[PDB]
Design a protein around this nucleic acid. Structure first.
Ligand code: NA
Ligand code: NA
Length: 319
DNA sequence: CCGACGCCGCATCAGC
DNA sequence: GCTGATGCGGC
DNA sequence: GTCGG
């Protein structure tokens, strides 16, 4: 736990302060595989056999193990610029660029943000408004309640809407972090249109039953906002609603359910058997390497069929 | 040694 | 006003 | 920062 703590700390710092995005992904992967090793690590070199752990992280692992600290992370926990940037990026809509600029002109705390509302954009004010509620997990039976509303609410506007709640939730996790719902209708396909306001008429509707309460961003395919159960008053939760063409929905569902490691191996195994998977389509590879036209997917198993894989129910789409 | 490392929708801004 | 670039969240 | 062509 200590090692993966430290690694993750180095990641957030490289993302938020350094803006070294790839250094951040490297610490992240380094931390994930260590978090999965089933022994207490005893030397740097030991982890060095792992994929993503190289010469510099193992030198840090040795220092941590020898001393219980990392001098570099200490210098970073001092230095008020780094910590205030890092803190401010916890506000949704406040990224490394906004955070750095804020601290440059003295905007360092949540309260500094309150006093400077006029200096925030809309997404940032909402993120600030729900700062504490957004950092708190969503337990399963709450999602189910949240599921029961979106599915039932979107059935009312048009029973030919098809909606699926994905993420950890549908893989069966007991905790969720937000609510990812995918959405389709007979009108909308990659070849055409037939209906202008499909995703609008969902959002307008869950607004009227006062479930959706704020909008971070909205257009004709992606919505981002806040939602909440009816009344203690329930905490506000993040929700995304994604409208996807029918011919790509099930590739959408397969993708947005995960995990990232299950898509990792299914995509790589698809290549073994001659197919390439993206969040949209499964397409064949000519023996020259060029992809063909998208195959048809009517259900999730169709994708599993092409690459000749036994279907893995979302519950065990972990590895 | 050295470039790759994720790619996209929406909001906002720079630059005309 | 237009269009293209960038910040942002996040699977 | 680690990996691989
Ligand atoms: Na290694
Ligand atoms: Na943020």
């Amino acid at each position: 736990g200590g090692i993966t703590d430290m690694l993750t700390e180095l990641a957030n710092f490289e993302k938020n302060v350094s803006q070294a995005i790839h250094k951040y992904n490297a610490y992240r992967k380094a931390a994930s595989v260590i978090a999965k090793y089933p022994h207490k690590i005893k030397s740097g070199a030991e982890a060095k056999k792992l994929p993503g752990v190289g010469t510099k992280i193992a030198e840090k692992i040795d220092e941590f193990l020898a001393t219980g600290k990392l001098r570099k992370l200490e210098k970073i926990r001092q230095d008020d610029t780094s910590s205030s940037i890092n803190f401010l990026t916890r506000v949704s809509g406040i990224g490394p660029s906004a955070a750095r600029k804020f601290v440059d002109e003295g905007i360092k705390t949540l309260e500094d943000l309150r006093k400077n509302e006029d200096k925030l954009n809309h997404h940032q004010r909402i993120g600030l408004k729900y700062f504490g509620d957004f950092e708190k997990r969503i337990p399963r039976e709450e999602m189910l309640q949240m599921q029961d509303i979106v599915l039932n609410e979107v059935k009312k506007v048009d029973s030919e809407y098809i909606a699926t709640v994905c993420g950890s939730f549908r893989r069966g996790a007991e905790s969720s972090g937000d609510m990812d719902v995918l959405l389709t209708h007979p009108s909308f396909t990659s070849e055409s249109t037939k209906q202008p306001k499909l995703l609008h008429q969902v959002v307008e509707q869950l607004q009227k039953v006062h479930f959706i309460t704020d909008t971070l961003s909205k257009g004709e395919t992606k919505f981002m906002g806040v939602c909440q159960l009816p009344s203690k008053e329930y905490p506000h939760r993040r929700i995304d609603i994604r409208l996807i063409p029918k011919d790509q929905y099930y590739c959408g569902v397969l993708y947005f359910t995960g995990s990232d490691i299950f898509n990792k191996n299914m995509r790589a195994h698809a290549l073994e058997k001659g197919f390439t998977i993206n969040e949209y389509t499964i397409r064949p590879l000519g023996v020259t390497g060029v992809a063909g036209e998208p195959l048809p997917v009517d259900s999730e198993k169709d994708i599993f069929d092409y690459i000749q894989w036994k279907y893995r129910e979302p519950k065990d789409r972990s590895e």
